[model samples]
Target: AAIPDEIARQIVLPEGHKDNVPLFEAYRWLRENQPLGQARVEGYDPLWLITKYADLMEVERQPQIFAAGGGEDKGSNNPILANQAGDEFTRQLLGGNLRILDALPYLDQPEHSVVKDVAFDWFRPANLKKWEDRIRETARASIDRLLAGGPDLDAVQEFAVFFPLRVIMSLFGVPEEDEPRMMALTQDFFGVADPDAQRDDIEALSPDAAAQQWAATIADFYAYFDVLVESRRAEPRDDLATLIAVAKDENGEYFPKTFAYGWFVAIATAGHDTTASTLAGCLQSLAAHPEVLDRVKGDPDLIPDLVNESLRIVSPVKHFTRVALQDYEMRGQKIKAGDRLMLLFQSGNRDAEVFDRPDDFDIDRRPNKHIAFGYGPHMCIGQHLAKLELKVMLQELLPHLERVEVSGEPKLIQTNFVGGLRKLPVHLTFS
Candidate 1:
């Protein structure tokens, strides 16, 4: 049997996840009763909602059977769930390619590895350590800006968003003046479904309208990065952009122009927004949980754990869709070739079997197996940088705060993929 209509609607709709109460409740029900249930929402393809942690990992581990980038016949292989119109629009935009961008997440196997290796070493722990001084400087500056708005502020708008944005920009050698442009484009790319994030001219939130807005945002990103890629190729720099721009493929030739731009698009967008979303949650979680905050404030070493816990609770990247290439069985459910499934990372993070008291914000939650960065072969490539960014921010921010609390009702962004707090109003008491 399919999932209950009411419950299934929540899984597919953006508004259903705004507050997270209904969404979490829905997740709990499905995990306990329908771990492999199907959501047959209108306007969207039928998606198997993979909730349990074990099942999600199993699916990811066998990418051969459960493919990414959809099927050759499908023509659309979006990692994010979208309506039929949105999917078709993206397919056309990519000239019948499987994905909107030829980024790692949009590619499978040999292609994914080839694109990833271009800048893979740059994001590793050892390589990232070299950039710690610069990242910390950015963190300190972010805290300074936050304090300038002191006492009352939207932590997300003033602090969380800017810190991670600047860090990613710094890696790309993006200029300070261009920060606002990247920020706006990143927000639109990930937050296309959110009302406040959409362009003002869009009269209503229809599938076609979202598709148009999304396409325009992608076009803008490609247009902007095209200039940077050309500059970096002509004059190499000690930055990630140069690596992607000049990297050669196995055939000993430079990657196609579209492929290089896709790398820029992936790193530029995912690198910033995901960390920003997690940082917003980190601040909100700290404000809500004074004990956790006090503990971190006392011991700077705990910052890593704090970041890990926040990633678990926030689960910012949300669900990613995978297409089945062959029939497979999971938890006694039957599957067929060409079927699509959505691995709900947010729900899996709260699986009681995997985490103790999954709802509570426990900073000491060790061996924290939260799949916020996902798992298996397709795990987030920039995870080390993301963690380092969070830790550095907390180290810089916590010391300046004697106390912090929510000043107004917090709001979560209304998007099914890659979202956390939209507004986190807080009152801070500087040390």
Candidate 2:
């Protein structure tokens, strides 16, 4: 039976609730009845909701027909729908000016290639190998820090959050002492809907004031990165900071100062938070399934597969927007040109048509073509590096961690953009 519009509205509770089962139920209904249904949010333009696995892949594969510009337009020209700051901010953020979407593995050809090259230069396999010893040391230090605290610790706060932040920050040339400021900015930037983190009573404030706060945060980021970019230019170093400082455009020109700042902020913010969320999700899942944990512990080789499966189960990036370049038809529904589409990556991983048993978390799920890192030209550039980090961390952690178990309910970040646990209390013993 088709889900009535009213019920769908209730189920799809604005931006953040889309991950809840009720929203999935509504999405499943729409897939059956309105696979190309229009998604309407209050005070925003309506967009086409492409729910099926095949359709989602098709949209990703055809970036030319489905453009990746116009930061806020609903359709092909832009993939991210702008709100609060409107189209201008959206464009400034995602239009390769700062390479925000470049970190995203969904942008099309030439632009994707350029950004990917810069990221690849910094995150190459050899480069990652060079950091393995350092990463392991960092991991050990973090574990020691956690162990010194007590038996009961928030895994998300202590280990998962701090570890990745430390690694990524180091890569960006950020000092260890400055992590708190970065964390604060990350919370404000991505955790807008989070009650504890949101200031000025985000929910109660007038739309304009709320927007001002958002803009202010972005401005502060820009200012911070501006100084960093200038420093890199003055004294080039062997870090991502230097890489972006020297990256060139198609015309063989260095990135503009504004774009350079944007790129730095995007990398610092996205790199740390996304990896942190995945690490948290992995630990949480392992705690829930001790048998799986034991298997990985018994044989370290299983850690790679475990990482793949954990990502499949809980993709950190929930959704990415896409625009339709021209009017197109799918499953008998007409999708007009300029219509926005939010490709629910989490849903894509769970689509019944794609996996044998989408809900079942199996460590050895082979040929796992999950799009956790995205696909095609826009696919994640640091994918290999991310895997390397996970592999190394797990190897070091498994031997030291005697017993790991969750102590309380896992809390998720209250944002539709990046999804993961905010806190995961766990009891652990070190060998």
- Candidate 1 residues 181-227, lDDT tens each? 98888888877788778876554567666777777887898899889
Tell me the TM-score of each prediction against the true structure. Answer: 0.97, 0.87
Show pairs that collide, candidate 2: 69-77, 74-340, 75-323, 75-338, 76-323, 76-324, 105-378
If candidate 1 were superposed on the true structure by all CA atoms, what would the RMSD be?
1.5
Tens digit of per-residue lDDT, candidate 2, span 147-206: 788778888887788887888888888788988988888877776544556655344344
RMSD to the true structure for each prediction, in A, is: 1.5, 3.7
Worst 10 residues of 1 by lDDT: 70-79
**CA shift of 378, model 1, Å:** 1.4
lDDT of each: 0.84, 0.68
Cα RMSD for candidate 2? 3.7
